[PDB]
Amino acid sequence: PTPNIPSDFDFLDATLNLERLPVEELAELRKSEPIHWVDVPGGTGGFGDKGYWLVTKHADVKEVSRRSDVFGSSPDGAIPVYPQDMTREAVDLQRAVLLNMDAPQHTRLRKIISRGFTPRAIGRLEDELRSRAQKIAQTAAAQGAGDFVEQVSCELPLQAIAELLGVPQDDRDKLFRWSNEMTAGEDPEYADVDPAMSSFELISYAMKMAEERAVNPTEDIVTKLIEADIDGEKLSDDEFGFFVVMLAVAGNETTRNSITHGMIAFAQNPDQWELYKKERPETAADEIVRWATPVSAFQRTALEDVELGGVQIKKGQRVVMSYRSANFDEEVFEDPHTFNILRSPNPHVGFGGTGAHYCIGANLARMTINLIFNAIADNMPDLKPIGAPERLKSGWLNGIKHWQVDYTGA
């Protein structure tokens, strides 16, 4: 235990992160105790254990990601922190979705699901999504000023999911509503949502979608997923249901928050914003994701006694990967605290470290990001912040709820 950071300091506390990301504190661990145990003697929310290991170095985060055979996702799920009213029961059924599964079921399911995220599948959405990105930006610009999150950041990630699944336009409203209801669990502004009922209804909708496409096939990814490959592999209707639920949370608030933090970074760095508007560099999306790191941390659970960075980890202890720390590791990134959209190479772990659970939607997210910022630069290139960004109350998701902006910059 380093003298500079006491073990009782909870890096994942939602109240702390509402105020700020513990950036300086993580930086301290990297110099003194890169693998660090956090004490929560009263019992952690949801899990009910007495603490967790925190991994702060880029190299060590990659090693954990790579060694799924000893660092599992199913005992406690990937999400590393829950409020105190969270039950052990709710934690232990996170395993019903891909993110929180281990081998062999994860191996089979990811292989099938990967059909939906080929270059062809993603690239075929580009025209429709660009069209929408433009109209999103134009509509916001016409308002003069307003909340950037709701008027610019929010819609395109949702539409991307919709266009990928081939959701009919008349159903997208309730789809978006359900998705947005599943993005709570701490913040008091969202205290009257029902995420459980929303997930239930979303599963139901998805299952019927699979049953319809089974009789009337289309050229969206749903048909690709529910039909047997050369080896007879396919998603059952319920599996597809839990896949859609997975998508609703995985590709919604993540991309949304990368866009908002992206624009904030551009506001704090006029030089880079001018550079983007003039050259539209392809490296921009990845520096945005590194800078935002929408997922601050995900965890694993040790399936057996194991040594990591000279530290003995005991079976059942949780191992939390700090993506936020790793993405600013001074041994990996040159000038990590400079926002540079031309950054190359850019080995960030914002989409996770290479391994079994590496983000399957990463290229879809990059496309979404590129399209919305191309549209912003095209329809509101002189936008300026009016108010301070209001942060989301979450211990692991680096979210922004609101950000008042003058689009015409007048």
Report if residue 394 touches ligand HEM, rule: CB under 6 A: no
Q: Is 232 helix (H, G, I), strand (E, B) or coil?
A: coil
Q: Rounded to an integer, what distance in angstroms lies between the CA atom of residue 287 and that of residue 350?
A: 10
* From candidates 122, 225, 246, 375, binder to ligand HEM by CB under 6 A: 246
CA nearest neighbour of 107 among 143, 154, 72: 72
Judged by CB under 6 A, the stretch of 137-145, 219-227, 251-259, 393-401 that binds ligand HEM is 251-259
In residues, how long is the chain? 410
Backbone angles phi, psi at 404, to 5 degrees: -75, 125
* From candidates 5, 129, 154, 161, binder to ligand HEM by CB under 6 A: 161
Q: Shortest distance, CB of residue 193 to ligand HEM, whole angstroms? A: 21
Q: Which is nearer to ligand HEM, 69 or 271 (CB)?
A: 69
Q: Shortest distance, CB of residue 159 to ligand HEM, whole angstroms? A: 11
Report if residue 350 touches ligand HEM, rule: CB under 6 A: yes
Q: Shortest distance, CB of residue 370 to ligand HEM, whole angstroms? A: 12
| Token pair belonging to 296 | 């601050």
Residue type, 340: N
Tell me: is residue 359 an annotated ligand-binding position.
yes
Q: Shortest distance, CB of residue 82 to ligand HEM, whole angstroms? A: 15
Q: Which is nearer to ligand HEM, 141 or 371 (CB)?
A: 371
Q: Which is nearer to ligand HEM, 32 or 94 (CB)?
A: 94
Q: Rounded to an integer, what distance in angstroms lies between the CA atom of residue 156 and that of residue 131?
A: 10
Q: Which is nearer to ligand HEM, 145 or 247 (CB)?
A: 247
Count the site residues for ligand HEM by CB under 6 A: 26
Judged by CB under 6 A, the stretch of 5-13, 119-127, 185-193, 349-357 that binds ligand HEM is 349-357
Number of other residues whose CB lies within 10 A of the CB of residue 67: 16
Residues 252-291 that bind ligand HEM (CB under 6 A): 254-255, 258, 289
Q: Which is nearer to ligand HEM, 90 or 121 (CB)?
A: 121
The angle at the Cα of 11, spanning 5 to 16, to the nearest 5 degrees, equals 110
Q: Are strands 51-55 and 35-39 parallel, antiparallel or unpaired?
A: antiparallel
Q: Shortest distance, CB of residue 226 to ligand HEM, whole angstroms? A: 17
* From candidates 72, 352, 389, 395, binder to ligand HEM by CB under 6 A: 352
Backbone angles phi, psi at 35, to 5 degrees: -115, 110
C-alpha separations of 219 from 148, 159, 170, 383 in Å: 34, 17, 19, 39
Sign of CA dihedral 398, 403, 406, 408: positive
Specify whether the CB–CB gap between 105 and 242 falls below 8 A: no
Q: Rounded to an integer, what distance in angstroms lies between the CA atom of residue 129 and that of residue 251?
A: 15
Report if residue 365 touches ligand HEM, rule: CB under 6 A: yes
Residues 283-342 that bind ligand HEM (CB under 6 A): 289, 294-295, 298
Q: Which is nearer to ligand HEM, 145 or 359 (CB)?
A: 359
Q: Is 264 helix (H, G, I), strand (E, B) or coil?
A: helix
Neighbouring residues of 219: CB distance < 8 A, sequence distance ≥ 6? none
Judged by CB under 6 A, the stretch of 40-48, 120-128, 244-252, 377-385 that binds ligand HEM is 244-252
Binding mask 76-115 for ligand HEM (x = CB under 6 A): --x-------------------xx----------x-----
Judged by CB under 6 A, the stretch of 44-52, 211-219, 232-240, 354-362 that binds ligand HEM is 354-362
CA nearest neighbour of 407 among 69, 140, 201: 140
Q: Shortest distance, CB of residue 36 to ligand HEM, whole angstroms? A: 20
Q: Are strands 71-72 and 297-302 parallel, antiparallel or unpaired?
A: antiparallel
CA nearest neighbour of 291 among 268, 263, 261: 261
* Binding residues vs ligand HEM (CB under 6 A): 73, 78, 98-99, 110, 161, 246-247, 250-251, 254-255, 258, 289, 294-295, 298, 350-352, 357, 359-361, 364-365
